[PDB]
Amino acid sequence: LKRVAVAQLCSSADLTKNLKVVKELISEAIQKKADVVFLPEASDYLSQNPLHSRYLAQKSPKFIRQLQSSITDLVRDNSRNIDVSIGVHLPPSEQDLLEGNDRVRNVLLYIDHEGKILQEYQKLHLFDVDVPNGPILKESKSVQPGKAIPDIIESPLGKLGSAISYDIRFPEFSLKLRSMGAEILCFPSAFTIKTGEAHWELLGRARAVDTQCYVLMPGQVGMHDLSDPEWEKQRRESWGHSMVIDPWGKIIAHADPSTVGPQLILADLDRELLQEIRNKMPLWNQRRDDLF
Amino acid sequence: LKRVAVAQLCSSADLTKNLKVVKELISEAIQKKADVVFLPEASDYLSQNPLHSRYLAQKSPKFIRQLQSSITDLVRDNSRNIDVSIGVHLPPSEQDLLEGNDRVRNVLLYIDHEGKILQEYQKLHLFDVDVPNPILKESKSVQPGKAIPDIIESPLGKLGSAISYDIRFPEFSLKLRSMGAEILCFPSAFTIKTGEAHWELLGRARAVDTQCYVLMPGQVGMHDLSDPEWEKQSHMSALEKRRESWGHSMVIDPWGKIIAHADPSTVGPQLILADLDRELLQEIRNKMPLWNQRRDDLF
Numbered sequence: 187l188k189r190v191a192v193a194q195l196c197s198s199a200d201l202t203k204n205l206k207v208v209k210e211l212i213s214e215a216i217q218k219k220a221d222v223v224f225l226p227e228a229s230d231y232l233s234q235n236p237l238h239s240r241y242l243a244q245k246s247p248k249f250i251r252q253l254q255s256s257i258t259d260l261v262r263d264n265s266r267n268i269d270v271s272i273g274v275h276l277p278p279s280e281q282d283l284l285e286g287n288d289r290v291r292n293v294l295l296y297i298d299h300e301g302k303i304l305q306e307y308q309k310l311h312l313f314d315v316d317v318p319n320g321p322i323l324k325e326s327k328s329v330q331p332g333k334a335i336p337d338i339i340e341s342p343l344g345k346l347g348s349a350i351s352y353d354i355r356f357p358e359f360s361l362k363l364r365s366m367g368a369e370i371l372c373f374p375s376a377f378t379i380k381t382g383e384a385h386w387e388l389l390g391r392a393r394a395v396d397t398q399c400y401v402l403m404p405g406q407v408g409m410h411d412l413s414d415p416e417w418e419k420q421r422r423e424s425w426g427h428s429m430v431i432d433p434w435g436k437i438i439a440h441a442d443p444s445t446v447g448p449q450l451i452l453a454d455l456d457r458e459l460l461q462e463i464r465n466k467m468p469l470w471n472q473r474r475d476d477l478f
Numbered sequence: 479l480k481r482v483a484v485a486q487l488c489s490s491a492d493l494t495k496n497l498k499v500v501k502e503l504i505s506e507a508i509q510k511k512a513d514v515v516f517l518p519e520a521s522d523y524l525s526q527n528p529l530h531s532r533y534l535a536q537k538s539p540k541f542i543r544q545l546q547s548s549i550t551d552l553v554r555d556n557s558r559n560i561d562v563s564i565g566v567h568l569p570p571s572e573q574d575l576l577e578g579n580d581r582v583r584n585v586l587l588y589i590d591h592e593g594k595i596l597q598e599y600q601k602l603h604l605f606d607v608d609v610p611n612p613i614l615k616e617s618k619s620v621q622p623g624k625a626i627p628d629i630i631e632s633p634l635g636k637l638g639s640a641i642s643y644d645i646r647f648p649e650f651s652l653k654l655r656s657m658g659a660e661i662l663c664f665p666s667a668f669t670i671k672t673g674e675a676h677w678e679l680l681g682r683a684r685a686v687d688t689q690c691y692v693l694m695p696g697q698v699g700m701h702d703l704s705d706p707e708w709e710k711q712s713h714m715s716a717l718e719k720r721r722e723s724w725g726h727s728m729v730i731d732p733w734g735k736i737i738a739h740a741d742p743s744t745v746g747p748q749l750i751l752a753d754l755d756r757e758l759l760q761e762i763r764n765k766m767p768l769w770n771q772r773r774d775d776l777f
């Protein structure tokens with residue numbers, strides 16, 4: 187049994203305020219003896235519009251640098267290792283701008299105990315959706331789509347496949363990650379209210395059952411304060427309900443609905459249980475690759 | 479508003495008795511103005527073992543011919559059309575036998591108002607599983623299919639067909655949608671343990687993944703598999719001579735909402751109805767155009 191921490195937070199437009207919350211949650215995860223802590227999509231910031239996102243993304247490389255140092259500081263101060271999986275934004279590359287693409291990158295970072303960035307997964311599927319009884323969102327206006335399938339990470343919990351929010355809606359991605367050797371899948375998200383109440387738990391449980399993997403789901407929660415009285419002169423609401431799901435689709439950890447804002451949930455991952463399930467229903471020996 | 483009927487029943491090893499139940503359910507569906515009726519996997523029979531299955535599959539063609547005739551009779555007698563989707567077994571062909579394959583075919587039939595068979599879908603993924611808290615191995619008695627089922631232009635809209643365990647392989651449902659499906663059916667004989675766990679989850683998930691209406695006809699109850707004449711012939715003792723099914727038949731919309739569900743407080747056969755709305759399906763697809771956003775450059 188290995189210990190995982192899944193964080194639930196509420197990003198603002200303020201990167202310093204967010205970093206403080208992120209640092210405390212990681213510190214809390216170390217004390218509760220988790221080997222990896224998982225934090226939601228857009229943990230660095232959420233923005234009012236495409237232009238505000240481009241503005242804040244410029245501050246993101248600094249945010250990341252300070253995060254890396256905080257991890258090494260906390261590892262040393264606590265006398266135990268931890269790895270960090272976190273959703274951030276990134277500015278366009280120098281090539282990207284000359285190439286005529288001035289959009290930010292929605293990225294999931296994996297940072298080991300040495301503060302070393304092991305993976306930068308850029309979101310493949312972008313949220314361009316007219317939410318029924320909800321907002322009209324077009325992620326592709328401010329965000330550039332990723333170019334590659336992310337590698338399996340040999341994590342302290344085991345083999346990890348990573349994805350971001352809307353990626354969860356495309357089963358072929360999760361299936362491919364299992365084919366590559368995933369034992370654990372993560373879906374850090376800033377999930378809307380209306381789709382969240384409809385599909386969050388459903389999709390999380392389905393992907394766990396479909397792939398026979400543990401599924402980790404860090405989610406943003408509540409109404410986001412996008413207030414920026416520096417950018418405004420000189421709406422977003424997230425579902426929360428962060429959870430951990432076993433390879434049989436059972437919820438084994440869930441966020442406390444009462445407590446407002448930042449919280450941490452804990453679960454112990456069992457490799458024997460995972461192997462038992464895959465042995466009893468060997469789906470990966472039963473696919474019809476000849477046809478599909 | 480196109481009306482579908484989904485049937486829940488409890489198959490025995492007696493094809494004559496099973497046919498009677500099926501005829502009554504189709505008759506009821508016509509009276510209730512259903513345009514298509516969907517019946518479960520193995521509506522012709524369930525068997526005690528792989529040998530029993532092969533013995534019984536020999537009676538299946540006669541079951542099917544009589545069913546075809548009943549359909550045209552009922553259509554005539556009610557002056558109203560209905561199509562029928564029903565799971566049966568079929569014996570192996572001469573070619574199968576020539577190749578050393580004497581296993582039966584687990585087949586989903588689509589039969590039209592004229593008694594004409596438009597599709598025989600042979601199940602692709604066979605249930606070979608250690609059920610947590612009876613070991614089942616479908617491939618001992620059943621040969622896997624080799625074809626992807628065509629989309630059927632049904633009275634309700636474009637139909638994709640699948641059988642039970644097929645539901646666990648999302649790429650199959652995704653393919654049906656890619657080929658133009660608006661409705662998916664998963665006629666089934668699902669175990670209690672896996673039904674409790676995953677029946678509702680997988681039905682709803684497939685609905686949401688594909689943005690299709692999902693139809694879920696299920697076997698229910700403890701099956702009576704006794705066949706004294708076969709038991710005599712194969713020389714079985716009492717000790718030599720179990721199946722129980724989940725039921726919970728349902729109709730799910732493209733957003734994942736259960737809109738029709740079997741009544742738990744009735745034993746044996748029952749019919750559920752739902753009026754399907756193509757406009758709801760189109761609206762959902764327009765607002766979240768998943769099939770315009772897939773990454774086929776990578777998958």
Ligand SMILES: O=C(O)CNC(=O)[C@H](CS)NC(=O)CCC(=O)C(=O)O
Nearest residue numbers: 228313323325351352376377378381
């Ligand atoms: O805007 C940013 O900066 C980061 N991107 C997000 O927060 C996006 C929306 S634009 N959230 C999702 O895709 C969640 C998926 C979801 O809600 C569903 O699949 O139903």
Ligand SMILES: O=C(O)CNC(=O)[C@H](CS)NC(=O)CCC(=O)C(=O)O
Nearest residue numbers: 520605614616642643667668669672
């Ligand atoms: O023996 C026969 O005649 C065939 N009858 C069946 O009921 C078959 C295989 S034994 N059932 C399933 O595949 C149900 C799937 C299921 O229960 C799951 O996906 O967990």
Ligand SMILES: C[As](C)(=O)[O-]
Nearest residue numbers: 364365367368470
């Ligand atoms: C390497 As595998 C058992 O996830 O197909």
Ligand SMILES: C[As](C)(=O)[O-]
Nearest residue numbers: 538539542568595
């Ligand atoms: C259902 As038949 C015996 O006509 O193939």
